[PDB]
């Protein structure tokens, strides 16, 4: 079944149709040009939600919609995605996050990620979870290292789903294993 998880503040849940509106708004915001070359139109936003909902439908877990009881129905997503692409560290499971700027600076992505990794190791019994981003995305790989995920620069890779001359091609790899997760 589609796993519903609970943080102290956050509800990690399956996506609803109403979430597409809120996600599209996030992805149209000029502040996303810090992370992406250009803002997303509704068709692009909807294309990613389709991938998320496909993953949930096929696997029973995925990047959970973030509900904040007392505040907002949807502030972004955080959760697990199967790595199936042809890279050195695949097959494995990655953790990813996209938060509305209004909810930055509150440890909410931190809380969401801890809840997802608790699920990853205690429930799914995964040997490891990975994360990857571009070198300039300090906010994203900052959260990875604050979670206790660790990077080997030797494991830097070209993203095989991006063309050769794509500026974001070069990615850095973070890992956390069941063992290191228990140490917190
Ligand atoms: C990567 C991302 C999730 C990080 O979010 P964040 O809120 O900065 O990260 P955290 O949840 O770990 O919170 C850490 C911050 O909260 C603060 N904080 C306050 N209380 C805290 C607490 N109890 N625990 C942790 N941090 C806390 C920290 O001091 C830190 O502030 P800082 O960034 O100035 O150092 C966010 O920047 C993001 O989603 N970016 C991508 C957006 C995007 O791609 N959108 C496109 C949509 S299509």
Concatenate the DSSP letters of all residues of 75-97 into one string: SEEEEEEEE-SS-TT-SEEEEEE
Domains detected in the chain: 5-183 (3.40.630.30)
Q: What angle do CA 78, 109, 4 make, to 5 degrees?
A: 45
The residue with tokens 């890779």 is 157
Smallest CA separation from ligand 1 atom 47, residue = 27
Give the determination technique: X-ray
Atom in ligand 1 nearest the alpha carbon of residue 99: 39
Atom in ligand 1 nearest the alpha carbon of residue 103: 7
Smallest CA separation from ligand 1 atom 20, residue = 106
Q: What is the four-CA torsion angle of 8, 45, 87, 141, rounded to 10 degrees?
A: -50
- Quoted resolution (Å): 1.9
What is the 32 CA–ligand 1 centroid distance (Å)? 14
The residue with tokens 């850095």 is 172
Question: End-to-end CA distance of the chain, in Å?
Answer: 29
Q: Are strands 150-151 and 5-6 parallel, antiparallel or unpaired?
A: unpaired
Q: Annotated binding site for CoA: which residue ranges? A: 97-99, 105, 137, 142-144
Cis peptide before 105 (omega within 30 of 0): no
């Amino acid at each position: 079944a589609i796993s519903e998880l609970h943080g102290p503040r956050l509800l990690l849940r399956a996506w609803r149709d109403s979430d597409r509106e809120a996600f599209a708004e996030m992805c149209a915001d000029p502040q996303v040009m810090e992370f992406f070359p250009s803002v997303l139109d509704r068709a692009q936003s909807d294309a990613l939600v389709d991938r998320v909902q496909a993953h949930f439908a096929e696997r029973g877990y995925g990047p959970w919609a973030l509900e904040l009881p007392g505040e907002a129905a949807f502030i972004g997503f955080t959760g697990l995605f199967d790595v199936t692409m042809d890279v050195h560290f695949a097959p494995t499971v990655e953790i990813g996050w996209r938060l509305a700027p209004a909810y930055w600076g509150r440890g909410l992505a931190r809380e969401a990620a801890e809840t997802a990794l608790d699920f990853a190791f205690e429930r799914l019994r995964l040997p490891e979870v990975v994360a990857f981003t571009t070198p300039p995305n300090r906010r994203s790989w900052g959260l990875m290292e604050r979670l206790g995920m660790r990077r080997d620069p030797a494991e830097d890779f070209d993203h095989p789903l991006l063309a050769a001359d794509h500026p974001m091609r070069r990615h850095i790899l973070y890992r956390v294993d069941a063992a290191r997760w228990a140490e917190r």
